[PDB]
Ligand binder design. Structure first.
Ligand SMILES: O=C(NCc1ccc(S(=O)(=O)c2cccc(C(F)(F)F)c2)cc1)c1cnc2n[nH]cc2c1
Ligand SMILES: O=C(NCc1ccc(S(=O)(=O)c2cccc(C(F)(F)F)c2)cc1)c1cnc2n[nH]cc2c1
Lengths: 469, 471
């Protein structure tokens, strides 16, 4: 079972001994440091607060366990047993910490304070940065949500341009990343972050995360439809690809169905199998139940364009009010190979150049959506800015000579609206001067309790694109 | 509680309706597909997955109903195979009728070889083999962490041996700083455990408990750390009192090794004036078993390491070792823990060698580069069906996409063997049955809900040793 005394970087076990004597306060903050990705979606802290930080997180057993582990890990006794016991005895093991944060779903420019952390008991000065490691993991849902939203912006631009509206936008980028992430827990967190922006997911783990920690009015936040994989095609034998196709589309005759078509020869499959042999089974389908053809190999742009050209000669294509080509409503394409933010952009621009509407296509993204991301992308960072020692408050910061980009903010921080309606972070307690109105951070955690929270429905609202608004 | 019925890709819920009728067996395999460097991979991590997620009673009435309810809304349709899951519950008390055979954990195997196979043991459960693709394929992560970590050990070993004449301290030269930089607590434990296959230094505490619970070691713990500052414990003293912070910290930890980040304001000043003059007397008095380890944390990693060494070499008594390389006094060492991945690690040690500094002088910390900056595409980790039985006839199956030969999959029943020259070969089409190639290196590790063969972390470390270490 999870032990918060074992959920920090090893060296922080030794930090209580290193602060100035008589330090009563350590105040720290998190930002996506400024140096693409000019704004970030703040999402995922609520999960962390609830799963890991709230309530009785310290017990006698947990203290003894950490002591026993650290004795061996350090080959020495450096663990702060006394400090953790104080929390257990004084607060029934509830963390005497206060955290303030911007609302989940908020879209905030880089280099602003997103959350702050401080101890509420002078004895627990060391506690603020003990929990740095767990809190900093919020980088992941923030970065997934942010990158997913940037992709939605691209899709919106091109869908709007080639079709004249945004119908179907929230189903244009589907999460295929379950197998390509590093763990079950990561799958749930990452999938939920993608769902801030879209409604299509195969990463089932995200649904229960959202239900437990955020909630939606709707029964579920994300959806899928039947689809083949290579095994359900290839199992029929190399000479029976047509039979597999026919069986699958007949099994799923009245719901949407996606069929991967590149097991042997994508171009043959589109031109001869779907386009001729089984055409009669496709042109009969409901607009509510298209066949969605899936290529899965080759150059992503070149393959998409060739697949569309093939289908456009076998099926009745129309020209929409914008002058772009549209497959008939019972036939669509999904490209779910090699898709990341860069290749997504190359594909939609390439389709636009060849006069194909973005209405024709959806994208699936796995590793690119959920795994190919690091803390460096948005420079997510947690730093101490204020301490009280001998009763005196001091504004503190790092400012490395060789890299101004790593300079941290000083003193007590607050978030405000500027006269033009943008965000500004005020340093050095200047928020107290009340020249910039009220602090936009809310207390979300205090003394073991979650004090403010957001539904997944409100997070989605906060995260909307300007174009959608 | 974890629900295996909710731990697959959505579309796999619909696959039981798509296989050929009269199919009794689906047999699938996992490989790190050969591309067109990472020419060999460390197989590690399956044992964790088997124990945490696959073994024992994993199906219950409540879990089946839960899945039914979720999928009804997720698909806006009733597609879920309730009958198939009920069958497993009734006939096998909720244990998976699956057999998995795998190469021993720790084994180092060239790309394009079978690492494990999966098949159903009951004809009714043909659909189950690929249901669990999603959870099994996540083994890509500990494989890739272990492999990339080992490739870094090879670079360190080559340069340590060249500049010092031996491998002393190699197992402590790449420390895991990745706890905060990975995507979740679970990922942290798994990734940290995989790094420990190759090294002994970690700050990612989560790895220790995973190893104890799922693998085990003779020693109390698999990994170690030592006291160290962070920017907060320096900056809290105030900009004008960096020296006071340094003095306080090395005095607190005067008898153990201690690392002190030195770039809060001016790394070069800190080394030349603070460590090299003001506080020199507190450094030169230290034990060889308790050095000060100076940590820069910004600037160009190579340029900064070299300049730091340049500065320290002029303030402290440096010797020339028997290989002609410069060596800091035993009480003074350096760790570079910013911007390190396999590429920059290589650039740093080669740069050090060019400037005649022994690799003895330095250690590396890696966080995101070590544990997060990896994907399934690095080693092309992939799970594919190679054999099915339909109407009682076995057929060898595969994909072979016209526009990408690299994605062609293997055919039929597979086995892994030693070649006459002592290398590895995967035999396809059941050809291992001909017995021309000695015994199958795959062992049954899971069968019908039970883990049937396990490895200790000690055995895994042994299997994953570098050739240079063996020699
Ligand atoms: O095809 C897969 N999953 C099913 C699937 C997902 C997404 C689509 S879609 O065309 O975007 C689509 C169409 C209509 C409704 C929805 C809706 F509204 F439901 F979202 C989604 C169609 C089918 C699939 C394929 N390959 C994969 N690799 N790894 C995971 C994978 C998942
Ligand atoms: O300094 C940090 N951790 C403590 C630490 C780790 C590793 C070393 S080391 O020089 O490799 C070393 C020296 C002697 C023994 C060991 C031994 F045998 F114990 F492994 C390790 C010295 C100190 C640290 C620094 N920055 C970080 N960012 N994110 C996580 C971080 C952790």
């Amino acid at each position: 079972e999870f032990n918060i005394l074992l959920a920090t970087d090893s060296y922080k076990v030794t930090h209580y001994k290193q602060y100035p004597p008589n330090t009563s306060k350590v105040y720290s903050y998190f930002e996506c440091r400024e140096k693409k990705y000019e704004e970030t979606v703040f999402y995922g802290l609520q999960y962390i607060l609830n799963k890991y930080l709230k309530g009785k997180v310290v017990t006698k057993e947990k203290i003894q366990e950490a002591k026993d582990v650290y004795k061996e890990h350090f080959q020495d006794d450096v663990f702060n047993e006394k400090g953790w016991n104080y929390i257990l005895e004084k607060y029934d093991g509830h963390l005497p910490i206060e955290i303030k944060a911007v609302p989940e779903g908020f879209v905030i420019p880089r280099g602003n304070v997103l959350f702050t952390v401080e101890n509420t008991d002078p004895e627990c000065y060391w506690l603020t940065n003990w929990i740095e490691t767990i809190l900093v993991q919020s980088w992941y849902p923030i970065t997934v949500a942010t990158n997913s939203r940037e992709q939605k912006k691209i899709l919106a631009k091109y869908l709007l341009e080639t079709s004249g509206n945004l119908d179907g936008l929230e189903y244009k980028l589907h999460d295929f990343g379950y197998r390509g992430v590093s763990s079950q827990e990561t799958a749930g967190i990452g999938a939920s972050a993608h769902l801030v922006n879209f409604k299509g997911t195969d990463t089932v783990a995200g649904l229960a995360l959202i239900k437990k920690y955020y909630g939606t009015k709707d029964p579920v936040p994300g959806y899928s439809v039947p689809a083949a994989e290579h095994s359900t095609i290839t199992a029929w034998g190399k000479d029976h690809e047509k039979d597999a196709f026919e069986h699958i589309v007949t099994q799923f005759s009245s719901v949407p169905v996606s069929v991967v078509s590149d097991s042997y020869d994508i171009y043959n499959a589109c031109e001869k199998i779907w386009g001729e042999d089984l055409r009669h089974l496709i042109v009969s389908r409901s607009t509510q139940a298209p066949l969605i053809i899936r290529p899965d190999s080759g150059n992503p742009l070149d393959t998409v364009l060739k697949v569309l050209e093939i289908l456009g000669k076998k099926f009745p294509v129309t020209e929409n009010s914008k002058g772009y080509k549209l497959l008939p409503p019972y036939l669509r394409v999904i490209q779910g190979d090699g898709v990341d933010i860069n290749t997504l952009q190359e594909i939609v621009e390439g389709m636009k150049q060849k006069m194909w509407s973005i209405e024709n296509i959806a994208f699936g993204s796995g590793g690119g959506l959920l795994q190919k991301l690091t803390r460096d992308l948005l420079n997510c960072s947690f730093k101490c800015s204020y301490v009280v020692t001998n009763g005196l408050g001091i504004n503190v910061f790092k400012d490395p000579v060789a890299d101004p980009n790593k300079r941290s903010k000083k003193g007590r921080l607050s978030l405000h609206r500027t006269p033009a309606g943008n965000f500004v972070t005020l340093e050095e307690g200047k928020g107290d001067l009340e020249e910039y109105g009220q602090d936009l951070l809310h207390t979300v955690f205090k003394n073991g309790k979650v004090t403010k929270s957001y539904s997944f429905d409100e997070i989605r609202k906060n995260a909307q694109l300007n174009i959608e608004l």
